[PDB]
CSV table of C-alpha atoms (C1' of nucleotides) and ligand atoms in Angstrom, one decimal:
chain,number,residue,atom,x,y,z
A,219,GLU,CA,6.0,-18.5,-9.4
A,220,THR,CA,6.8,-15.6,-11.5
A,221,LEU,CA,4.9,-13.5,-13.9
A,222,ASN,CA,5.1,-15.4,-17.6
A,223,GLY,CA,7.5,-18.1,-15.6
A,224,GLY,CA,5.9,-20.4,-18.1
A,225,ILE,CA,7.0,-18.0,-21.7
A,226,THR,CA,10.7,-18.5,-20.2
A,227,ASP,CA,11.1,-21.9,-18.8
A,228,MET,CA,9.1,-22.6,-22.4
A,229,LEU,CA,12.0,-20.3,-24.3
A,230,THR,CA,15.1,-21.5,-21.9
A,231,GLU,CA,13.8,-25.3,-22.8
A,232,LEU,CA,13.7,-24.8,-27.1
A,233,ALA,CA,17.6,-22.6,-25.8
A,234,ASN,CA,19.0,-25.3,-24.4
A,235,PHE,CA,18.0,-27.9,-26.4
A,236,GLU,CA,19.0,-25.3,-29.9
A,237,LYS,CA,22.1,-25.5,-28.4
A,238,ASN,CA,23.2,-28.5,-26.8
A,239,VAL,CA,21.3,-30.8,-29.5
A,240,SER,CA,20.2,-29.1,-32.0
A,241,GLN,CA,24.4,-27.5,-31.9
A,242,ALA,CA,22.4,-23.8,-33.8
A,243,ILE,CA,24.3,-21.4,-31.7
A,244,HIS,CA,21.6,-18.6,-33.3
A,245,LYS,CA,18.7,-19.8,-31.6
A,246,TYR,CA,19.8,-21.0,-28.5
A,247,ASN,CA,21.1,-16.7,-28.4
A,248,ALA,CA,17.6,-15.7,-29.6
A,249,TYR,CA,16.1,-18.0,-27.2
A,250,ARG,CA,18.0,-16.7,-24.7
A,251,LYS,CA,16.9,-13.5,-25.2
A,252,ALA,CA,13.6,-13.3,-25.9
A,253,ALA,CA,13.6,-15.6,-22.6
A,254,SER,CA,15.9,-12.3,-20.8
A,255,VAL,CA,13.4,-8.9,-22.5
A,256,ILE,CA,10.1,-10.9,-21.5
A,257,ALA,CA,11.6,-12.1,-18.2
A,258,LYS,CA,12.2,-8.2,-18.0
A,259,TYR,CA,8.3,-7.2,-19.2
A,260,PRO,CA,6.0,-5.7,-16.2
A,261,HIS,CA,3.1,-7.3,-17.5
A,262,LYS,CA,1.2,-10.6,-17.7
A,263,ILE,CA,1.1,-11.9,-21.7
A,264,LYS,CA,-1.9,-12.5,-22.8
A,265,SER,CA,-0.7,-12.9,-26.3
A,266,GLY,CA,2.5,-14.1,-29.1
A,267,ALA,CA,1.2,-10.5,-30.9
A,268,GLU,CA,2.1,-8.5,-27.0
A,269,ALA,CA,5.5,-10.2,-27.2
A,270,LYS,CA,6.4,-9.5,-30.1
A,271,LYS,CA,6.1,-5.8,-30.0
A,272,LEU,CA,9.5,-6.2,-27.3
A,273,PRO,CA,12.9,-6.3,-28.7
A,274,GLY,CA,14.5,-10.1,-29.4
A,275,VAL,CA,10.8,-11.7,-29.7
A,276,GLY,CA,9.4,-12.3,-33.4
A,277,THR,CA,7.2,-14.2,-35.3
A,278,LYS,CA,8.0,-17.8,-34.2
A,279,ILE,CA,8.4,-17.1,-31.1
A,280,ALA,CA,5.2,-14.7,-30.7
A,281,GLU,CA,3.5,-18.2,-32.5
A,282,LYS,CA,4.8,-20.8,-29.9
A,283,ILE,CA,3.2,-18.1,-27.3
A,284,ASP,CA,0.0,-18.4,-28.7
A,285,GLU,CA,0.4,-22.0,-29.1
A,286,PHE,CA,1.7,-22.3,-25.1
A,287,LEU,CA,-0.7,-19.9,-23.8
A,288,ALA,CA,-3.8,-21.5,-25.4
A,289,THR,CA,-3.0,-25.5,-24.5
A,290,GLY,CA,-0.7,-24.7,-20.9
A,291,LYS,CA,2.5,-26.4,-23.1
A,292,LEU,CA,4.2,-27.2,-26.6
A,293,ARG,CA,4.1,-30.4,-28.7
A,294,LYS,CA,7.0,-29.9,-29.9
A,295,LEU,CA,8.4,-29.8,-25.6
A,296,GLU,CA,6.2,-32.8,-25.7
A,297,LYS,CA,8.4,-34.5,-27.5
A,298,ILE,CA,12.0,-33.4,-26.8
A,299,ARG,CA,10.7,-34.3,-23.3
A,300,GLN,CA,9.4,-38.0,-24.3
A,301,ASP,CA,12.5,-38.3,-26.4
A,302,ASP,CA,15.6,-39.9,-24.4
A,303,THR,CA,18.5,-39.3,-26.8
A,304,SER,CA,17.9,-35.2,-25.8
A,305,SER,CA,17.6,-36.3,-22.6
A,306,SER,CA,20.9,-37.7,-22.2
A,307,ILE,CA,22.6,-35.3,-24.4
A,308,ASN,CA,21.3,-32.2,-21.4
A,309,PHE,CA,22.5,-33.9,-18.8
A,310,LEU,CA,26.1,-34.6,-20.5
A,311,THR,CA,26.2,-30.8,-21.0
A,312,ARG,CA,26.2,-30.0,-17.0
A,313,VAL,CA,29.5,-31.8,-16.6
A,314,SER,CA,32.5,-28.9,-16.8
A,315,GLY,CA,34.3,-30.4,-20.4
A,316,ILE,CA,31.4,-31.9,-21.7
A,317,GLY,CA,29.8,-29.5,-24.0
A,318,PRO,CA,26.6,-29.9,-27.3
A,319,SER,CA,29.6,-32.5,-29.4
A,320,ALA,CA,31.4,-33.9,-26.7
A,321,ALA,CA,27.5,-35.0,-24.9
A,322,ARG,CA,27.0,-36.4,-28.4
A,323,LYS,CA,29.6,-38.0,-29.2
A,324,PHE,CA,29.3,-40.0,-26.2
A,325,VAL,CA,25.6,-40.3,-26.5
A,326,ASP,CA,26.3,-41.7,-30.2
A,327,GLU,CA,29.2,-44.9,-28.3
A,328,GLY,CA,26.1,-45.8,-25.1
A,329,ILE,CA,28.1,-43.2,-22.9
A,330,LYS,CA,25.0,-41.5,-21.0
A,331,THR,CA,25.4,-41.3,-17.6
A,332,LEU,CA,27.4,-40.5,-15.2
A,333,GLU,CA,28.8,-44.5,-14.3
A,334,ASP,CA,29.1,-44.2,-18.3
A,335,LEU,CA,31.8,-41.8,-17.8
A,336,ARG,CA,33.1,-43.0,-15.1
A,337,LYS,CA,34.3,-46.4,-17.0
A,338,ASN,CA,35.3,-44.9,-20.4
A,339,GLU,CA,37.5,-42.3,-18.2
A,340,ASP,CA,39.8,-42.7,-21.3
A,341,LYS,CA,37.2,-41.7,-23.5
A,342,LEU,CA,37.9,-37.4,-21.6
A,343,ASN,CA,40.1,-35.0,-21.4
A,344,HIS,CA,41.4,-33.7,-18.7
A,345,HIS,CA,38.9,-31.2,-18.1
A,346,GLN,CA,35.3,-33.2,-18.3
A,347,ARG,CA,37.8,-35.8,-16.0
A,348,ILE,CA,37.8,-32.7,-12.8
A,349,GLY,CA,34.4,-32.3,-13.9
A,350,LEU,CA,33.1,-35.8,-14.0
A,351,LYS,CA,35.4,-36.1,-10.1
A,352,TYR,CA,33.7,-32.7,-8.9
A,353,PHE,CA,30.0,-33.1,-10.6
A,354,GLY,CA,28.3,-32.6,-7.5
A,355,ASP,CA,30.6,-29.5,-5.9
A,356,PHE,CA,30.8,-28.4,-9.0
A,357,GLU,CA,26.0,-27.6,-8.7
A,358,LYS,CA,26.7,-26.5,-5.3
A,359,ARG,CA,26.6,-22.7,-4.5
A,360,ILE,CA,28.8,-21.0,-2.3
A,361,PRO,CA,27.1,-19.0,0.2
A,362,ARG,CA,28.2,-15.5,1.0
A,363,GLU,CA,29.5,-15.9,4.2
A,364,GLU,CA,32.1,-18.4,2.0
A,365,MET,CA,33.7,-16.3,-0.9
A,366,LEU,CA,34.5,-14.2,2.6
A,367,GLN,CA,36.8,-17.0,3.5
A,368,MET,CA,38.4,-17.6,0.1
A,369,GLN,CA,38.8,-13.7,-0.1
A,370,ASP,CA,40.6,-13.8,2.6
A,371,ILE,CA,43.1,-16.7,1.6
A,372,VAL,CA,43.5,-15.2,-2.5
A,373,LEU,CA,44.4,-11.8,-0.6
A,374,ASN,CA,46.7,-13.2,2.5
A,375,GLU,CA,48.9,-15.7,-0.1
A,376,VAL,CA,48.7,-12.8,-3.1
A,377,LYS,CA,50.5,-10.9,-0.9
A,378,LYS,CA,52.7,-13.4,0.4
A,379,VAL,CA,54.3,-13.5,-3.3
A,380,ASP,CA,54.7,-9.6,-3.6
A,381,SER,CA,52.8,-6.9,-1.7
A,382,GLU,CA,52.4,-5.0,-4.4
A,383,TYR,CA,50.1,-7.4,-6.7
A,384,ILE,CA,46.4,-6.0,-6.2
A,385,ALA,CA,43.3,-9.6,-6.0
A,386,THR,CA,39.9,-8.1,-6.9
A,387,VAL,CA,36.9,-10.9,-6.1
A,388,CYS,CA,34.9,-10.2,-9.2
A,389,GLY,CA,31.4,-12.2,-10.7
A,390,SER,CA,28.1,-12.1,-8.9
A,391,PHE,CA,30.2,-11.2,-5.7
A,392,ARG,CA,31.5,-8.4,-6.6
A,393,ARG,CA,27.3,-7.1,-7.5
A,394,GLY,CA,26.7,-8.6,-4.0
A,395,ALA,CA,24.6,-12.2,-4.3
A,396,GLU,CA,24.0,-13.7,-1.0
A,397,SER,CA,25.8,-16.9,-2.8
A,398,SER,CA,27.7,-17.8,-5.8
A,399,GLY,CA,28.6,-20.4,-8.4
A,400,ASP,CA,32.4,-19.9,-8.3
A,401,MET,CA,35.2,-17.4,-7.0
A,402,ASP,CA,36.7,-14.9,-10.6
A,403,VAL,CA,39.8,-13.1,-8.9
A,404,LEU,CA,40.7,-10.6,-11.2
A,405,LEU,CA,44.7,-9.3,-10.4
A,406,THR,CA,46.5,-6.9,-10.9
A,407,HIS,CA,50.3,-5.7,-10.4
A,408,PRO,CA,52.7,-2.9,-11.6
A,409,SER,CA,55.1,-4.7,-14.3
A,410,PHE,CA,52.2,-5.9,-16.4
A,411,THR,CA,51.0,-3.1,-18.3
A,412,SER,CA,48.8,-2.9,-21.8
A,413,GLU,CA,53.1,-1.3,-22.8
A,414,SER,CA,55.0,-4.4,-21.5
A,415,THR,CA,57.2,-5.7,-23.6
A,416,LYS,CA,57.4,-9.3,-23.0
A,417,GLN,CA,54.4,-11.8,-21.4
A,418,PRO,CA,54.1,-10.8,-18.2
A,419,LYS,CA,55.7,-14.8,-16.3
A,420,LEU,CA,53.1,-13.4,-13.1
A,421,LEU,CA,50.2,-15.5,-12.6
A,422,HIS,CA,52.3,-19.4,-12.0
A,423,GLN,CA,53.5,-17.4,-9.1
A,424,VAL,CA,50.1,-16.7,-7.5
A,425,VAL,CA,48.5,-20.1,-8.6
A,426,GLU,CA,51.9,-21.9,-7.2
A,427,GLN,CA,52.1,-20.0,-4.1
A,428,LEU,CA,47.4,-21.2,-3.5
A,429,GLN,CA,48.9,-24.8,-4.4
A,430,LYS,CA,51.5,-24.7,-1.6
A,431,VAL,CA,48.6,-24.3,0.7
A,432,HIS,CA,46.7,-26.7,-0.4
A,433,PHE,CA,44.5,-23.9,-0.9
A,434,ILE,CA,43.7,-24.8,-4.8
A,435,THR,CA,43.9,-28.8,-5.1
A,436,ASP,CA,43.3,-28.5,-9.0
A,437,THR,CA,43.6,-27.3,-12.6
A,438,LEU,CA,41.4,-26.8,-15.5
A,439,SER,CA,43.6,-24.2,-18.2
A,440,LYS,CA,46.9,-22.5,-17.4
A,441,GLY,CA,47.9,-20.1,-19.3
A,442,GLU,CA,49.7,-15.8,-18.6
A,443,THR,CA,46.9,-14.0,-18.1
A,444,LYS,CA,43.5,-17.2,-16.8
A,445,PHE,CA,44.0,-19.7,-14.6
A,446,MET,CA,40.5,-21.9,-14.1
A,447,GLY,CA,40.8,-23.8,-11.2
A,448,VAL,CA,39.3,-25.8,-8.2
A,449,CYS,CA,40.1,-24.9,-4.5
A,450,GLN,CA,38.3,-26.1,-1.5
A,451,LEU,CA,38.3,-24.0,2.3
A,452,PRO,CA,40.4,-25.6,5.2
A,453,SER,CA,38.3,-27.5,7.7
A,454,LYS,CA,33.4,-32.1,7.2
A,455,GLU,CA,35.2,-31.3,4.3
A,456,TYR,CA,33.9,-28.1,2.3
A,457,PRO,CA,32.8,-28.6,-1.1
A,458,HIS,CA,35.7,-27.7,-3.8
A,459,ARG,CA,34.7,-24.8,-6.0
A,460,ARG,CA,35.7,-23.4,-9.6
A,461,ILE,CA,38.1,-21.2,-8.6
A,462,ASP,CA,39.3,-18.9,-12.0
A,463,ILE,CA,41.9,-16.0,-12.1
A,464,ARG,CA,42.5,-13.0,-14.8
A,465,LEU,CA,45.7,-11.5,-14.6
A,466,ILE,CA,44.6,-8.1,-16.5
A,467,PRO,CA,47.3,-5.3,-17.5
A,468,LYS,CA,47.6,-3.4,-14.8
A,469,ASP,CA,46.1,0.2,-16.5
A,470,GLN,CA,43.0,-1.2,-18.9
A,471,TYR,CA,41.6,-2.7,-14.8
A,472,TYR,CA,38.2,-0.1,-15.5
A,473,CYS,CA,37.4,-2.1,-19.1
A,474,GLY,CA,39.1,-5.8,-17.0
A,475,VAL,CA,37.1,-5.2,-13.8
A,476,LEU,CA,33.8,-3.9,-16.0
A,477,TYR,CA,34.3,-7.6,-17.7
A,478,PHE,CA,34.7,-9.6,-14.6
A,479,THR,CA,32.3,-8.1,-12.7
A,480,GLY,CA,29.2,-9.3,-15.3
A,481,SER,CA,26.5,-10.2,-15.1
A,482,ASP,CA,27.3,-12.5,-18.8
A,483,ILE,CA,24.0,-11.0,-19.8
A,484,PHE,CA,24.5,-7.9,-18.8
A,485,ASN,CA,28.0,-8.2,-20.8
A,486,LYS,CA,26.4,-9.1,-23.1
A,487,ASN,CA,23.5,-6.6,-23.7
A,488,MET,CA,26.1,-3.2,-23.5
A,489,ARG,CA,28.8,-4.2,-25.8
A,490,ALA,CA,25.4,-4.7,-28.5
A,491,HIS,CA,24.7,-1.4,-26.8
A,492,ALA,CA,28.5,0.0,-27.4
A,493,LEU,CA,28.3,-1.4,-31.3
A,494,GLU,CA,25.1,0.1,-32.3
A,495,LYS,CA,26.9,3.3,-30.5
A,496,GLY,CA,29.8,3.1,-32.7
A,497,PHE,CA,32.2,1.9,-30.2
A,498,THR,CA,33.0,-2.1,-29.0
A,499,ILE,CA,34.2,-3.4,-25.4
A,500,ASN,CA,36.7,-5.9,-24.9
A,501,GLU,CA,38.1,-7.1,-21.7
A,502,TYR,CA,40.4,-4.5,-22.4
A,503,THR,CA,39.9,-1.2,-24.1
A,504,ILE,CA,36.4,0.7,-26.3
A,505,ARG,CA,37.3,1.4,-29.5
A,506,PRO,CA,35.7,3.8,-31.8
A,507,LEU,CA,33.9,2.2,-35.3
A,508,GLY,CA,35.2,4.0,-38.3
A,509,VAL,CA,33.8,4.3,-41.4
A,510,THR,CA,35.7,1.0,-43.2
A,511,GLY,CA,34.1,-0.3,-39.7
A,512,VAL,CA,37.0,-1.7,-38.4
A,513,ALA,CA,37.9,-1.3,-34.3
A,514,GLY,CA,40.2,1.5,-34.6
A,515,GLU,CA,42.3,2.9,-31.6
A,516,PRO,CA,41.4,2.6,-27.6
A,517,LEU,CA,39.7,5.2,-26.7
A,518,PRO,CA,41.7,7.3,-22.8
A,519,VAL,CA,39.1,5.3,-20.1
A,520,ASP,CA,39.9,7.1,-16.9
A,521,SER,CA,37.0,5.4,-14.8
A,522,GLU,CA,34.5,2.3,-15.0
A,523,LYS,CA,31.9,5.3,-15.4
A,524,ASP,CA,33.9,7.2,-18.2
A,525,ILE,CA,33.1,3.4,-20.4
A,526,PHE,CA,28.8,3.6,-19.7
A,527,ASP,CA,29.7,7.8,-20.6
A,528,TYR,CA,30.8,6.6,-24.4
A,529,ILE,CA,27.4,5.0,-25.6
A,530,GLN,CA,25.4,6.6,-23.0
A,531,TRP,CA,24.1,4.6,-20.3
A,532,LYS,CA,23.6,6.0,-16.4
A,533,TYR,CA,26.0,4.6,-14.8
A,534,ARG,CA,24.7,1.0,-13.3
A,535,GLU,CA,26.3,0.3,-9.8
A,536,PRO,CA,27.6,-3.7,-9.7
A,537,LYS,CA,24.2,-5.2,-7.8
A,538,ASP,CA,22.1,-3.6,-10.6
A,539,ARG,CA,23.9,-5.4,-13.4
A,540,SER,CA,22.2,-9.4,-12.4
A,541,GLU,CA,19.9,-10.6,-13.9
B,269,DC,C1',17.1,-11.0,-49.5
B,270,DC,C1',21.6,-11.5,-47.1
B,271,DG,C1',24.7,-11.4,-42.8
B,272,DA,C1',24.8,-10.2,-37.8
B,273,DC,C1',24.4,-11.6,-33.5
B,274,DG,C1',29.2,-10.3,-27.4
B,275,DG,C1',34.3,-10.5,-27.0
B,276,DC,C1',38.0,-13.5,-25.8
B,277,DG,C1',42.1,-17.4,-23.8
B,278,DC,C1',43.2,-22.4,-23.6
B,279,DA,C1',43.4,-26.9,-24.6
B,280,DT,C1',42.5,-30.1,-28.0
B,281,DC,C1',42.1,-30.6,-32.3
B,282,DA,C1',42.9,-31.3,-37.5
B,283,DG,C1',45.9,-30.6,-41.5
B,284,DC,C1',49.9,-30.0,-43.9
C,46,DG,C1',57.3,-30.4,-35.6
C,47,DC,C1',54.0,-26.0,-37.5
C,48,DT,C1',49.6,-23.6,-37.7
C,49,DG,C1',44.4,-22.3,-38.0
C,50,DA,C1',39.6,-23.7,-36.7
C,51,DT,C1',37.3,-25.8,-33.1
C,52,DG,C1',35.3,-26.8,-28.8
C,53,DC,C1',34.3,-25.4,-24.4
C,54,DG,C1',33.5,-22.0,-21.0
C,55,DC,C1',34.5,-16.6,-19.0
D,204,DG,C1',15.7,-17.4,-34.3
D,205,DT,C1',16.1,-11.6,-34.9
D,206,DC,C1',17.1,-7.6,-37.0
D,207,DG,C1',19.1,-4.0,-39.7
D,208,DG,C1',19.9,-3.0,-43.9
E,711,DCP,N1,29.1,-15.8,-21.2
E,711,DCP,C1,30.1,-15.0,-20.1
E,711,DCP,C2,30.9,-15.5,-19.0
E,711,DCP,C3,30.9,-14.6,-18.4
E,711,DCP,N2,31.5,-14.3,-18.2
E,711,DCP,C4,31.6,-12.5,-17.0
E,711,DCP,C5,30.8,-12.2,-16.6
E,711,DCP,C6,30.9,-13.4,-15.8
E,711,DCP,O1,30.2,-11.7,-14.3
E,711,DCP,C7,32.6,-13.0,-15.3
E,711,DCP,C8,32.5,-14.8,-14.5
E,711,DCP,O2,31.7,-15.4,-14.8
E,711,DCP,P1,31.2,-16.7,-14.1
E,711,DCP,O3,29.6,-17.5,-15.3
E,711,DCP,O4,31.6,-17.1,-12.9
E,711,DCP,O5,29.5,-15.6,-14.1
E,711,DCP,P2,29.2,-14.7,-12.1
E,711,DCP,O6,30.0,-14.6,-11.6
E,711,DCP,O7,28.0,-13.5,-12.7
E,711,DCP,O8,28.2,-16.4,-11.6
E,711,DCP,P3,28.4,-17.0,-10.9
E,711,DCP,O9,27.8,-16.6,-9.5
E,711,DCP,O10,27.2,-18.6,-11.5
E,711,DCP,O11,29.5,-17.5,-10.4
E,711,DCP,O12,32.8,-13.8,-16.6
E,711,DCP,C9,31.4,-13.1,-19.9
E,711,DCP,O13,31.1,-11.8,-19.3
E,711,DCP,N3,30.2,-13.6,-21.1
E,712,QPJ,C1,10.1,-22.6,-32.9
E,712,QPJ,C2,9.6,-23.0,-34.5
E,712,QPJ,C3,11.2,-22.6,-35.6
E,712,QPJ,O1,11.4,-21.6,-35.3
E,712,QPJ,P1,13.1,-21.4,-36.0
E,712,QPJ,O2,12.9,-21.3,-37.8
E,712,QPJ,O3,14.5,-22.8,-34.6
E,712,QPJ,C4,10.5,-23.4,-37.1
E,712,QPJ,O4,9.8,-23.0,-38.1
E,712,QPJ,C5,10.5,-24.9,-37.3
E,712,QPJ,O5,10.9,-24.7,-38.4
E,712,QPJ,P2,12.1,-26.7,-38.7
E,712,QPJ,O6,13.0,-25.9,-38.9
E,712,QPJ,O7,11.3,-27.2,-39.9
E,712,QPJ,O8,11.4,-27.7,-37.3
E,713,CA,CA1,9.8,-8.1,-31.6
E,714,CA,CA1,29.7,-28.9,-19.6
E,715,CA,CA1,31.3,-16.1,-11.0
E,716,CL,CL1,21.8,-21.4,-35.0
E,717,CL,CL1,24.5,-15.7,-32.3
E,718,NA,NA1,15.7,-12.9,-30.3
E,719,NA,NA1,34.0,-17.8,-13.5
DNA sequence: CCGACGGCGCATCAGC
DNA sequence: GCTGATGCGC
DNA sequence: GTCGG
């Protein structure tokens, strides 16, 4: 399969266990970070001591890598795999809206399967019912050809509402992925900027038009700057797809498109590197950290590249932000 | 030893 | 009613 | 779980 695939699968399994079963989010993030650095390491790891040189691999992961390399398994993961209760909780978190807390609450009350959830819809919130309704569709990848049909509809329909909107498809699509988990749309309008005195009421109008033409079929969440929902290409029916729309102040487009292009791991790595250089980056601003350790005033951003320059990173094209 | 760990929008929960 | 914490996801 | 202070 892959160089060190044994080790990174083992760390991913541990990560998922800590997140889904232990609800130990720091251990989850630790395992995820080690899995990522090892997956990038361009050599066959022969010992835990070799892995321990990598940033994010410590004593405990070195010891697991030693057990895994010597035995071809981890007894801890043997046991977790034996554990029906860990398995039920892991499975239920695959429903959109079910996290570790809901999954444990359900398994505690004997609700372990998709069938058990369908029998107990009164115990689900809206997001979970939609996640359940489209469980299969939401795990199917969107071929780039369909992403292009979807982009055509979104850009066409947004222009119908107001010719001044600019819609940009972000996420894996903007990084040039041949398939995407979902569709991420960044939206700007000239009347919505960082200096706007009142809450924008723009997103509702775009969501309404996409609902009116039956492209958007369901709503998971809706506020003034974020919509999360479900959409479907018109036709055998196409699968229902997740769609996220983010309305970002027009003058903060560079920070917005950097965030919304990802990847998630790239973003986490870039923001961590910013912190070590004395900056904090969010979807809106890059701010310097002062002596008191707190974010100062937003810095001028006149390009996507300016953000990289502040933290002294070589510019990466969207295609080079994947994992 | 210690606290930090990327940063945030929305829905729901929990408590006054 | 309200405000803030937690859950979940981007 | 790992790191930096
Ligand atoms: N934990 C996360 C998740 C996401 N994002 C940002 C970067 C992502 O690229 C973007 C959209 O999130 P998705 O989960 O849709 O990620 P992708 O579009 O990269 O992947 P996929 O093909 O799974 O949709 O949001 C982030 O900063 N942190
Ligand atoms: C992988 C080994 C673990 O590292 P972490 O601090 O999760 C622990 O050493 C296992 O110890 P336990 O929590 O006592 O099982
Ligand atoms: Ca190390
Ligand atoms: Ca889930
Ligand atoms: Ca995406
Ligand atoms: Cl933890
Ligand atoms: Cl963490
Ligand atoms: Na780590
Ligand atoms: Na998304």
